[PDB]
Design a protein around this ligand. Structure first.
Ligand code: B12
Ligand code: B12
Ligand code: B12
Ligand code: B12
Ligand SMILES: C[C@H]1O[C@@H](n2cnc3c(N)ncnc32)[C@H](O)[C@@H]1O
Ligand SMILES: C[C@H]1O[C@@H](n2cnc3c(N)ncnc32)[C@H](O)[C@@H]1O
Ligand SMILES: C[C@H]1O[C@@H](n2cnc3c(N)ncnc32)[C@H](O)[C@@H]1O
Ligand SMILES: C[C@H]1O[C@@H](n2cnc3c(N)ncnc32)[C@H](O)[C@@H]1O
Lengths: 194, 195, 194, 194
């Protein structure tokens, strides 16, 4: 697992070419899904750990996250966008971590589901209005922090779309039930739940 | 055509991303890389903002269009060269979450062979200064869309970020740049010529 | 390696739309340089071998090569073209295979070198005259065939520019030395050599 | 705009040339920029070389640039499905922009013109047209000598219909070779439907 360390080290020195080359190598080794699990995700977690310990600053994290977000968006577009009633994917209001939402939309598209990624931080009434107008079959929410969920009143997610899914590190079964959403433990079960 | 701007937004609003991606590529091929940004990307984003402010569209619709257009620009950014040598750090002031202006600056720089490192938006100044120092960055470029994040900064706050510091955007002006200790830049074209 | 098989089949059946889609697919997966290495080049090589074996005709090679040349030029125009003294890229007189020179120009542009791609088959006096007038720092020559080089006298490439580089299948260290040019093995070390 | 574009290319200013061509496209449109900008420049470049005012390397640079631009327009015109029309040049003819221009005008009228590139051997051209079930073959002749080198009826059986045009071609010569002569690119698609 040299690639994880090397990719991080390449990004931290502002070597985009080297970072890109290391990521492509991961894609070659593990394929699209594999490179997320073994490279993109571990690096994102380590970046958070390094910042938390004071080993790197915010600007370093920004650089790494922006790079990896660009790579995931590539895979997202590579997965394609099929016809039919879309599934809207975003994060609850106040939640600015968006890569979990992108990841969810990615796994849905891989299964032929037209997951529309909106970006993060969408007000619930606006989310519901879009879902209604596009005739969206479902809404998917990624919660990394728990406070944006705790800030919501009971039943807040209930009427967003015919089906409403909630997951992420910030989400739990008890909280999803309170908000009126279906809890999904992992991305594996999310794709099959539809 | 003047239809492409209308066409792209209409496709996005109906959730036709495939059609939207196709219309953008037509713009890219007709207007060129810089052209499609000026004549397609920017006018659509401006209209999206005006339509929301008038109450014609909701926030979720803006999110959809902006996320799409950001993805297109990032695609163009990665296709441009990225030369070796001391980098130029591009970001936005703390409190500024509009990031496409900074992305544009980074892109115009890369297109002229300047190693612009796009960081993403909203970077605390001490962290920005520390990264520039460690990488021996030649310059820092800031895009300010809102004026309030700049006003919240004390005098000379941007002075010691890098050997050269630039400030532009709708939220920026020559007077405010002088107060923060940065060089004001009106347009993206002259930015590359200044380096 | 399946994309290559798929891409060639689409071209051989005259399906340009599918071919363009497949190439963009490979571009998003392998990246800009990667798609040239893992898709464009292996397809071009296989096209050459198939024709030589008598499996495909000239018109079929023509179609695929014209297509792939168009894709590479598309990538070339999207790369940065920095200011400053240019680097002239072409092929020796008598050499009409031009994609190697285009590749060279592309790798240079991606590294922030103002590589001016001239097209193939350029007379040496005219090439020298242009290099002189534009104050070019270097001349880069791609030789696919060996015969065009062998037909040139000793030191024929010596005075083209302050630096002259020569690479490609038709080129070798011994032949580069005789012509008075610097031999370059890899496109990656071409930018560094400047 | 023509003079400036030519001057920009002659000094190796791709950015300036690119910007000037884009202005021509915005002002005159797709067809207009061909007639008012691309074609006049290509002709003047040839005149300039003939007079000794510019060298071959200069011409190459300008020609390669404009070929890239035309190819962009070619792809912008799209490629509709159906029985393809194969477009190339006679054996020995290396000027390819006339053929590209022909393929462009066909596509703008909804005709699936497959551009092969220049210089296709007639038996190979005939074999591909047969296998793809091509409705027609279109040939661009800039020089007359490649036509004069062909025997009577040489072009007759390439496809159900065979069109010949360009500076090197005339009505009598087309008739001799068994091809239909076309003066202007405009009435090419109308003739194919007739
Ligand atoms: C990048 C980053 C940011 C960037 C985000 C950029 C962007 N555009 O996305 C920015 C700079 C905005 C940021 C800000 C902040 N962040 Co932050 N950030 C991170 C970092 C490094 C990675 C985030 C990421 O993309 N992770 C990738 C996701 C996909 O990984 P994952 O959560 O493990 O997700 C898995 C599963 O949950 C599943 N999943 C995800 N979504 C969904 C959805 C469904 C439906 C399902 C089924 C599954 C699922 O997918 C993954 C499978 O392995 C994390 C570190 C970390 N450990 O995650 C910190 C982290 C999340 N952030 C943290 C903090 C503290 C903050 C700030 C408060 C900092 C500050 N003081 O300003 C702010 C809060 C902003 C806000 N209001 O949301 C802390 C959270 C601590 C806590 N629990 O309170 C972390 C954990 C860092 C740390 N180690 O301390 N952050
Ligand atoms: C998308 C968007 C968002 C997205 C951003 C997504 C993202 N990740 O980037 C989100 C949802 C986050 C958002 C939030 C908000 N936004 Co908003 N948003 C927009 C929108 C529709 C387009 C943004 C964009 O990219 N525009 C394109 C920009 C780059 O073009 P431009 O500024 O004219 O740039 C040109 C030059 O300035 C130059 N330039 C830019 N940067 C630089 C840098 C240098 C160095 C140089 C030389 C030149 C230069 O480049 C361009 C060349 O033509 C605009 C509408 C608009 N008209 O801009 C509103 C807009 C900017 N937002 C607005 C508002 C009100 C907000 C919010 C306060 C809304 C709210 N109530 O929450 C928040 C504020 C968040 C924050 N703290 O930053 C208002 C701003 C009004 C004001 N000036 O006070 C606008 C104008 C909409 C409106 N009301 O009409 N926004
Ligand atoms: C397309 C093609 C043509 C087209 C060219 C169209 C165009 N405008 O470019 C046309 C139809 C004109 C053509 C004609 C001919 N060709 Co031809 N053609 C090919 C084909 C299929 C691909 C050419 C190509 O672009 N390849 C891609 C090259 C760039 O890949 P590569 O060599 O592996 O390059 C790598 C490195 O060398 C490096 N490199 C390249 N340049 C440089 C430069 C520098 C500085 C550096 C550092 C590195 C470097 O880049 C790559 C990195 O992986 C090849 C097959 C092949 N294997 O190449 C045959 C091939 C080259 N052609 C061949 C032949 C026989 C001919 C003709 C004689 C056929 C004929 N009887 O008319 C003529 C000769 C024309 C001439 N005078 O040059 C033979 C050559 C055999 C030989 N060496 O003797 C080949 C090998 C086919 C075969 N038999 O398998 N050809
Ligand atoms: C660029 C160029 C080249 C490039 C080609 C690059 C490429 N890949 O295409 C290269 C370097 C290969 C080249 C080589 C040569 N060329 Co040269 N070249 C030119 C130049 C400057 C432009 C060619 C071009 O594309 N013109 C654009 C075309 C589209 O314009 P047009 O012919 O007026 O076309 C119009 C109509 O005819 C119509 N048309 C065209 N095709 C068709 C097809 C159909 C079906 C229809 C209906 C209509 C139609 O379309 C246009 C509508 O307005 C011309 C100058 C000129 N006046 O054309 C010289 C020119 C054609 N070349 C010339 C010469 C001398 C040569 C060489 C012999 C030079 C040499 N000694 O090596 C070689 C021959 C190579 C060969 N075997 O073909 C001379 C021809 C003189 C003559 N004897 O007739 C010219 C005229 C220059 C000059 N003034 O002396 N050439
Ligand atoms: C979770 C991530 O949040 C980022 N982070 C921490 N504080 C701030 C701030 N004031 N502004 C922007 N990003 C911040 C760090 O880079 C960390 O990695
Ligand atoms: C400038 C853009 O900000 C978006 N916007 C406005 N209010 C909010 C909010 N509460 N949360 C997120 N985005 C918002 C709108 O969609 C507008 O177009
Ligand atoms: C190297 C490439 O040269 C092409 N080729 C072979 N003979 C000729 C010819 N007479 N004219 C044009 N192209 C030719 C073949 O298509 C082969 O793939
Ligand atoms: C018609 C065009 O042919 C080009 N031309 C003339 N002689 C040669 C040669 N030996 N090799 C390649 N191109 C040549 C010139 O650039 C002229 O403009």
């Amino acid at each position: 697992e040299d690639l994880g360390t090397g990719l991080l080290e390449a990004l931290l020195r502002g070597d985009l070419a080297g970072a890109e080359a290391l990521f492509r190598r991961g894609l070659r080794f593990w394929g699209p899904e594999g490179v997320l699990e073994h490279l993109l995700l571990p690096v994102l977690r380590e970046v958070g750990e390094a910042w938390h310990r004071g080993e790197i600053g915010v600007a370093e994290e920004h650089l790494a996250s922006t790079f990896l977000r660009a790579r995931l968006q590539e895979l997202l577009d590579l997965a394609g966008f099929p016809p039919g009633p879309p599934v809207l994917v975003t994060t609850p209001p106040g939640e600015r971590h968006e890569i979990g939402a992108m990841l969810a939309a990615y796994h849905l598209r891989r299964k032929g589901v037209p997951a529309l990624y909106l970006g993060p931080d969408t007000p619930l009434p606006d989310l519901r209005a879009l879902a209604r107008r596009l005739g969206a079959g479902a809404v998917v929410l990624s919660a990394v922090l728990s406070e944006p969920l705790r800030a919501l009143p009971d039943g807040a997610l209930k009427d967003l779309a015919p089906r409403v899914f909630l997951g992420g590190q910030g989400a739990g079964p008890e909280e999803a039930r309170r908000l009126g959403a279906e809890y999904m433990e992992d991305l594996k079960g999310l794709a099959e739940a539809l």
